[model samples]
Target chain A: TLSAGNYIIYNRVLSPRGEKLALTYPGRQRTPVTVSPLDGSSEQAWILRSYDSNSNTWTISPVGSPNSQIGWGAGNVPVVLPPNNYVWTLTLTSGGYNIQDGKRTVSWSLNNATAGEEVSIGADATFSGRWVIEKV
Target chain B: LSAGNYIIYNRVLSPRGEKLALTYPGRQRTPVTVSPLDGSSEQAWILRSYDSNSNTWTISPVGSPNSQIGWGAGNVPVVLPPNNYVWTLTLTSGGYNIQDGKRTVSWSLNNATAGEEVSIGADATFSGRWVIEKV
Candidate 1:
C-alpha cells in the first residue's frame, strides 16, 4: 500500500540475445520504450530491476506488483533485467515517510514469458516490473 | 596438339563449391565465369559468350575447365565468364569491350580460384578479349 509520497519506479526488459527490449517509468508517466527488431529475426529474453533506499542501492529482480492493498497511482515502477531467457526475481522498495514514517520492501519470483506476451499489475502493489518474450 | 596457329595446352583443375575457376590470358588474368542455365540457385550452367561472328562458345560446368590452352606469340586470348556472380557482371552494360575494329567479349570468375567454397557475395573477375581478324 502506498502512503502518499513522491517516488520513482523504473522497469526494463531484455531479450534472450542480451539486448534491451523495453523500459518504463511509472512516476514520470512516460510511455514504455521498446527496442527495434532485427532483420529476419524474432523472439528474445528479459529481466527487471528496482531501487532500494534502505541499502541506498539498486537491485535486479522480476516483474510484477505483488501487493493488492496499496495503489501506487501510476508511472515509475522499479525493475532491471538482463538479456532475456532464464527465470528472474523482483524486489520492491518504498522510500520516504509513510503514515508510520518507515520504509517497506518486498520480493517476488517470475518465470519466462514467451515473446509477444503481456502481463498487467494491480494498483496496490509496488512493482519493479521488467519482462521479455523470446523470439519464435 | 598441332603447333602451327594453335594454343598451348595448360592443365585444367577441378571446380570449387559448384563452380569452376579459370584464369584469363593477360598480365592481369581474371577468374573463371559461371552462367546458370535455369533460374534455380544451382542448375545447368555454361561459360560466357566469346564471339558471335565465329559461332564459337566455351561450355564448362562449375568444376575444372575441360581444356586449358595458351595462345601463340602475338595472339592474345581473352577469357569470358557467365553473368550473375559478383564482379563477374558489371553494373553498367557495354562498360567492357574488346577493341575498336572488332567485338571481343570475355568473362571470368574473379579473385577466387578453383576448388574453393563459393560463398554468397564472393568477389571474382570474368573478362574477355578480341583478336583483330587478319584483314
Candidate 2:
C-alpha cells in the first residue's frame, strides 16, 4: 500500500551483457503508481515497453488516463533508452497542484539491492510550490 | 532699422509660402566697417552663399586681421534675403561675431523698407546688410 506521497516501482530488463536493468514503471499524467490517487495528482509516470532494433526506438506507454482529456494521462509515446544496464526512478508529489512533497521520497529496487543495482524514487518533503518546466 | 535678438531671416517666393526659393546678396561674404585699436579700421563682414544647382556653398571669412582672399572679416557668414526681397535684421553685438560684443539684446524686422531690390546688376541692402555686385 502506497501512502499519500510519491512512490516508485521497479521492473527488470535483461541486457545483452547478462546484466539486469531496473526498469522504472511509467504512467500517464505523472509517474507510475497503482495505489495513489489518479485525480489532480501532479505526478507523471513513464513506461518502457519493447525496443525496436530496426528504427532504434523504445516503445513506451503512459500508465494513467489518456492525455488531452482533463486529467493526468498520456498516450503511448515511443522513447529510446541507451543499450546498457539502465535503471530509473519515478518522481511523485502529494500536495498542491503540480507540486512535489519534499520530505517523502519512495524508491523501488530491482534485481539485488545489496549489489547496488536498485533504482530509488521518492517525494521531496520540502516541496511546497508547483513544478514548472522552463526553457532557457 | 528694427531691433531684436537672434534675427531669423527667411526667404520665400510668395508671401504665404514657407519654402525658401531664392536668396539675395549672393556673395560668399559681407563686409562691415570695423575700427581697430591701432586707429586702423578694417572691413568687418559676413557672408552666406549657396548654389543649389551646383551644390556649391561657402561662409564668409572669419577671424581678425581680415583676410582679403575671401568675404567678411571675423569669418562671419553674411545673411541672405528671401526671394520676395524680404529679410530680417537682428540687432546683435557687432552683428558679426556673437563673442565680439557684450550686448545681449538684438532686434530684427521684415518688409521694413522698399524691399531692398536685388538684381543681377543692381546693388541691394538686404535687411541691414549691404550687397554689391562684382565687375
Candidate 3:
C-alpha cells in the first residue's frame, strides 16, 4: 500500500523503446503535466496524500506546492490547477502500474514517447500509460 | 482461470471468416496459439483447480496435462509447469476477460492470423473477449 509520503512517478518505458521519464510540474498555473528526464528535482517528486481507503485512491500534489493538486482537466489532460477533486486509482500492470481516474474510464498516459510531451488519459492501457512509483 | 474443463472460443472472427479457439496446437510445450474452430482436443482446456480466495486459476491443455499456460516476459504467452503461473477469469457484460494472476495484462490476439501467438495486452479490448463453455 502507498503510505502518505513523497514519491517519484516514472514511466515504465525504460529500455528498448524509451528512456526513463518523470512527471514534472511546469512551474506555472493551469498547465498540463509534462515529461522530462529524471533530474531528481522537486518538480519530479510528488507528494501523495489524503488516501481514501474505501476507494483505494489518492490525491497527489507537487512536493513544494501542496495546494496545487493534480487533477483531470479539459481535453483529458492532467492539469496542475483547480485540483477538481480528482482522485486517482492505481492499478498494477505487467511492467508497472496504471494511474486511472476515479471513474476508471481513462488512465494517465504519455502523448508520445518523447520528453516535453503532455500527459493525457487514454481509453487503452498502452505501454506508454504504464508507470512505476518509487518511494523517496 | 476456470474450473474443470472448458473450451475458450473467441468472439472476434478471423480474416478467413471463422471463429477462433484458444489452442496449444500439436501438444507443443510452449507458445499458446489460436486457430479456427475445428473441435480438436488441443482446443480443450482444464483449469485443474481454482482458488477463489487468492483469485488464482491453474490451466492445462486437456490433451497435454503436463503443459500449462504461463506468463512470458514481453507479454508473450507460453507453456510452463502447472504451478508456474495463474489466470483470472472475469465475466464482463456479455463475455469473459482473462488476465494474469496479478490482474495485470489481458489475453489478446496479436492479429486475426490463425497461427499467431497469443499475447497479454494492456487493455480488455474486443480481441480479449472469449466465450468459455464446458466441454
Candidate 4:
C-alpha cells in the first residue's frame, strides 16, 4: 500500500530519460509542468494526498503548497493550478506506476524526453507514460 | 458614463458553443474565465471605483470588495488592489475592449488557450471583444 506523503516522480523510458517532474511556480493555472534534473529541489517534490483507496485516487500538490493542485487543463496539459478539486489515479504497474487524471481519460506523459520539456497526458500504457514514484 | 454592476461575457463562442464568462471565484491573484454561464453570483462584477483624473475604473467582483480585476506581474488577468492596477473599458467598433493599462483581456474558442487555461492576452485577433449586461 502506498502511504500518503511527499514523493518524487519521474519517467521510466531509460537513462538520460529519467527526469524529475517539476513545477516552476507555486501558484497559477495553465502554466505547463516541466521535467528537470533530479537535484532534490522542493519544486521536484510533490505532496500527494490519498482520496480513495479502491480507485487509487489522490490529489497532488507541490511540497510546501497545499492550496495548489497538479491537474490538467485543456489539451490534457498538466499544470499546478489553484484548488479545483481535481483528482488523479495512480495504479501500480509491472514497469512502474500509471498516473491518470480524474477529469481526463489519459495518463501522465512527457511531451519530450528533454529535461525542460512540458508534461501532458497521453494514451494509456504508452512508452513515455510510465512513471516511477518514490516516497520522499 | 454610468458605473453599475454587470456580468462580462466574451463575444466569441467556445468550440462547445459555450459563452466565455469572466468570473472571480476567490483567490485575489487569480481571476479566470469560465465557460457556459451558470448564472452564479461569482460571475457578477461591479464597475464602481472610477477615477476621473485618469479616466480609468477599478472593476471588482460581487463579493470581493478589496479585489480589482487587473493584470498581474506576468501580464495575466488577476483580481488585485485598485492602486496596483486599473482598466479602460473603451467602446470599440466590435464591442468593449477591456485593457488593463498594458494588455487587452482576450479569449479564444479553444480550451487551454482561454477559459480552461485561465488566461487572457493582448492579441490582434478579435478575441478581445467583450460585452456587458446589467445584473
TM-score per candidate, chains pooled: 0.16, 0.14, 0.49, 0.45
Model 2, range A1-136, lDDT digits (tens) per residue? 1122222221221121212122222333343322221222332343333233332222233334312111122331112233232222223232111211122233232222212232223332121111211111
Q: Give the root-mean-square deviation of each candidate in angstroms.
A: 23.5, 35.3, 16.3, 18.2
Cα lDDT of model 4 by residue, A1-136, tens digit: 6789988877643213222334333345568777776677787788889887767799898876767888776776688777877799987765356788764477877644446677777776344566767787
Winning model by TM-score: 3
Error of 2 at A108 (Å): 95
Name the candidate that leads on lDDT.
3
What TM-score number comes out for model 3?
0.49
Docking class of 4: incorrect
Q: Determine the C-alpha RMSD for candidate 2 after optimal superposition of all C-alphas.
A: 35.3
Q: What DockQ, between 0 and 1, does each candidate earn?
A: 0.01, 0.00, 0.02, 0.01
lDDT of 1 at B40: 32
- Alpha carbon RMSD to native, model 4: 18.2
Residue B87, candidate 4: Cα error in Å is 66
* Candidate 2 ranges with C-alpha deviation above 4 Å: A1-136, B1-14, B19-24, B28-100, B104-107, B112-135
Model 2: DockQ against the native?
0.00
DockQ of 3: 0.02
Worst-scoring 10-residue span by lDDT in model 1 chain A: A93-102
Cα displacement (angstroms), candidate 1, residue B41, comes to 32
Tens digits of per-residue lDDT for model 1, A12-94: 22222212223222221222222332222211121222234443332322233222112222332222323232221222222
Q: What is the lDDT of candidate 4?
A: 0.64
